[PDB]
Each structure stands twice: as C-alpha cells, then as structure tokens.
Amino acid sequence: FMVSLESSRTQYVNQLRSHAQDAATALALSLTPNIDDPAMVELLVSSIFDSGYYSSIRVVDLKTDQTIVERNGIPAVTNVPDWFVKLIGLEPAGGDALVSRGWEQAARVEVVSHPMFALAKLWQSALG
Amino acid sequence: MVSLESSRTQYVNQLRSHAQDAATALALSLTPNIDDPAMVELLVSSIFDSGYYSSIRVVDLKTDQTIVERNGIPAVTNVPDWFVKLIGLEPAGGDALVSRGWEQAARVEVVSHPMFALAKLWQSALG
C-alpha cells in the first residue's frame, strides 16, 4: 500500500494520460473527413465529451490559432452524497452480447457502465 | 425533480451504449477463446481494468452459471480532499493533429478527468 504507493501512482498517471491521448487521436481521426463542416465538428466533439469522462476538449484551428470548438467541465472531484443516488435512482443501463461456439450460443457477456461521472453531472445540475 | 428528466435519459443512453459497445467487443474477443478458461479471464480483466465499468460478467449458457465476473467501486466516491492533495495528480492531457494532405489544419486537445483514478487509489488505500 504505502510500499507500493509511488509505483501505483505512476501507473494511474500513465493510464489517465493514455486515456486522454487515445481520445484525442480518435477524435482527430473522426474529424478529418468532416473538418470543413462546422455542425459536424461540433457534433463529433459533443459525442465524446457528453460521457463526462473528460475535463475538457478543445479543437484549435492551426492557421488562425483560434478555438473552433471547446467544452469544459469542472476538473475537481465531485463528492456526490449517497442520498442523492437513491433520490435520482439511475437505472443501470447494462448491455450484453452472445458468444457462439460453432452454431450454438455458448455464453453471454454482461456489461454495466460505472455511473460516477453521470451522477457527478446530475449533482452539479442539481446545485444550479 | 422533473427538470432533470431529459438529462437523465441522455446519461442513461450514454451508459447503455458505452456498455453495449464493450459487451459486443468483448464477445467478439472471446469467440476464438471460449474453450480456454484462463484466456477468457485474462481478456475480461484486461477490458475491466482499462475502462470505467461497474461490472462485467460472463455466463455459461449451457449451465446458466457465472464463468467469470469482475465488480467495481461504489457509484459515488467519498474520497477526501486531503487524500486528493496527498496524491497531487497533475492534469492528464493528450493531443493530436488533423491534417489535410501534408497540410496541418487543426489540433485536438483532451484532458481526462481523474475522479475514477482517485476513487480507485482511495479504495485501495482503504485496503
């Protein structure tokens, strides 16, 4: 725990940085065939940002050096009270998929996404 | 509290599609590996560990019983601000270029929110 703190911290630092880099790389790719359609650019950026996973996303025009589109959330941690979760009562919204073995369905994969960012956003809205 | 109704359905839609995307990718990934229990477990953990999930479960349809399962941290975090300061993460950022042929047109800049990472460090600190 304390013995492994420095290495563990570095792992999370590297993980979060990779998370941000992967999103930028994916978004740049998504924007490439649409860079001259302002509406689509905004749509594609909103798509990614609306998860709540990112403190900020900005697209900068290199010729003019101006912001084309940007989005910002609060970068600090939001401590949402337990009682607000019950009050809001968010449904799990799980997803699933089948794995086949030959022609027979062999297993079902069930996934449930963590609501922490969604709850944080709902709480911020509640406070406003 | 009906004013947040539209916000709620939107976030639920996002959580659903995020989970569905992952279930579909994972099912695909498991397909060539379904008879190798160790590989199934490895692949499930790999996705679970690099994403923001409450749970991932694989059920054997022949027996209707759980094969492998991963469960996550609680819905909200009570990570104290004093612990956040002790860890003292700097912003986690990445950027990429959009080009038009050999011409560079735009730069995309992203900063990832650290709340999930900190929540995980905290749960670990609590042992």
Residue numbers in the entry:
A (entry chain D): 23 to 150
B (entry chain F): 24 to 150
Pull verbatim passages from the article behind this deposition:
Here, we elucidated the molecular mechanism underlying the function and regulation of P. fluorescens LapD, a transmembrane receptor essential for biofilm formation in this strain. As c-di-GMP levels change LapD switches between two states: the dinucleotide-unbound off state that retards stable biofilm formation by facilitating the secretion of the cell surface adhesin LapA, and the c-di-GMP-bound on state that supports cell adhesion by preventing the release of LapA from the outer membrane. Binding of c-di-GMP to the LapD EAL domain is relayed to the periplasmic output domain through an inside-out signaling mechanism that utilizes a juxtamembrane HAMP domain, a relay module often found in bacterial transmembrane receptors. Here, we present three crystal structures of LapD from P. fluorescens that provide models for the c-di-GMP-unbound cytoplasmic domain lacking only the HAMP domain, a c-di-GMP-bound EAL domain dimer, and the periplasmic domain.
In order to shed light on how changes in the cytosolic domain are sensed in the periplasm, we determined the structure of the entire output domain (residues 22–151). Crystals grown with selenomethionine-derivatized protein diffracted X-rays to a maximum resolution of 1.8 Å. The structure was solved by single-wavelength anomalous dispersion phasing. The final model consists of two molecules per asymmetric unit spanning residues 23–150. The periplasmic output domain of LapD forms an extensively interwoven, domain-swapped dimer sharing 3,429 Å2 interfacial surface area between the protomers (1/3 of LapD's output domain molecular surface). The dimer adopts an overall V-shaped conformation. Each arm of the fold consists of two α-helices and two β-strands contributed by one of the two protomers, complemented by two β-strands flanked by helical segments from the other. The two half sites are linked via a long connecting segment that crosses over at the center of the dimer. The other striking feature is a strictly conserved loop connecting the strands β3 and β4 formed by the conserved GWxQ motif (residues 124–127 of LapD). W125 forms the most distal point of the periplasmic domain located at the center of the loop, and its side chain is in an outward-facing rotamer conformation.
